[PDB]
Amino acid sequence: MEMEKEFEQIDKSGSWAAIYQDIRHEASDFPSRVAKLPKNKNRNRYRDVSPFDHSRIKLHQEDNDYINASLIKMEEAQRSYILTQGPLPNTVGHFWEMVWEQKSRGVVMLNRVMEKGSLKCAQYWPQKEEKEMIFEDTNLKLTLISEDIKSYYTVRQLELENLTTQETREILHFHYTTWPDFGVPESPASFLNFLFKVRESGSLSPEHGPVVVHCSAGIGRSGTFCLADTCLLLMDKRKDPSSVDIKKVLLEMRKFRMGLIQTADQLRFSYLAVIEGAK
Ligand SMILES: CC(=O)Nc1ccccc1C(=O)NN
Numbered sequence: 001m002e003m004e005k006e007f008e009q010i011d012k013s014g015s016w017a018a019i020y021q022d023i024r025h026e027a028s029d030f031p032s033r034v035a036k037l038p039k040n041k042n043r044n045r046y047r048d049v050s051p052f053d054h055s056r057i058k059l060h061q062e063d064n065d066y067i068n069a070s071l072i073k074m075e076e077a078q079r080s081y082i083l084t085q086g087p088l089p090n091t092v093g094h095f096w097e098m099v100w101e102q103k104s105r106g107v108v109m110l111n112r113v114m115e116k117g118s119l120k121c122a123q124y125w126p127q128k129e130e131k132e133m134i135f136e137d138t139n140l141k142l143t144l145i146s147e148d149i150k151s152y153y154t155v156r157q158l159e160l161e162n163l164t165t166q167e168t169r170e171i172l173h174f175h176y177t178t179w180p181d182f183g184v185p186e187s188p189a190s191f192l193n194f195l196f197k198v199r200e201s202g203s204l205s206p207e208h209g210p211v212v213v214h215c216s217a218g219i220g221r222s223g224t225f226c227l228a229d230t231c232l233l234l235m236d237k238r239k240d241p242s243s244v245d246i247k248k249v250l251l252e253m254r255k256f257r258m259g260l261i262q263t264a265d266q267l268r269f270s271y272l273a274v275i276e277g278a279k
Helices: 003-013 016-026 038-043 092-102 189-200 221-237 246-253 264-277
Strands: 069-074 079-084 106-109 133-135 140-149 153-162 167-176 211-214
Touching (some): 003 016, 003 264, 069 246, 079 221, 092 153, 092 211, 167 189, 189 221, 211 221, 221 246
Parallel strands (some): 106 167, 106 211
Antiparallel strands (some): 140 153
8 A cells, every 4th residue: 555645544544643552562572681681781771772682783892792782684675774772971982892893884873962951872972183082991093084064964074993903994973963852853854865865975885884873762763764764775676666564664673673663753754754755
């Protein structure tokens, strides 16, 4: 059923809440035993948001390999994403270790450091060229190279150096800066343009490791980003773009990380992003 028609049918009936709860009811449930170990309590921002054991990203150290991050692997779309929480004061070094070990080219950030008067994630990148950051626990150095600030998003060029081998890589930081404190954007125009800037970059492409995407919890706004990307590209691939069932793509993605899409408004916005994106 053409999603644009399904959309108007849900909107006229005002049943967004009922569709959304159907997804919550049918969603996968897998063990998260490593996340709940007592040694990992300060590695988790929220007690009710954990990566599944089967799909969690492992840090390449013998000490403690745990980070709140998941590999979403979409087989038919031929895309991979890592979805992770906003780094904490004690996980900033782990975050950049993961970016290094997984060979990511891009980081996508969908939140502000402060929202609603509270801290939503650590200040994990350098704000001035001449004041670089060093993560002593993971032996990495991070330098701001350049910054391009636009109305809806900022793009930063960063240099990440493995102080152990003295190899360097260029990482692109794509920061969406205008998601509102409450609700969802009124129009997806600026979200879609942000998405096609990340694609243009090569960050989503198979010659690199998976893109790292995050918000505060790594399930809401992060969910919207990878659902829209995957749904649009399936439409570019299949002989019938109307066969693309957004609810079925979301349940497939929810086999890899719990809670993706947090509200009925985010589900509606995702439809609006794919519907408008198809034009
Ligand atoms: C399929 C589609 O409409 N993509 C976009 C959406 C919104 C803004 C830009 C683009 C784009 O294509 N950029 N190169």
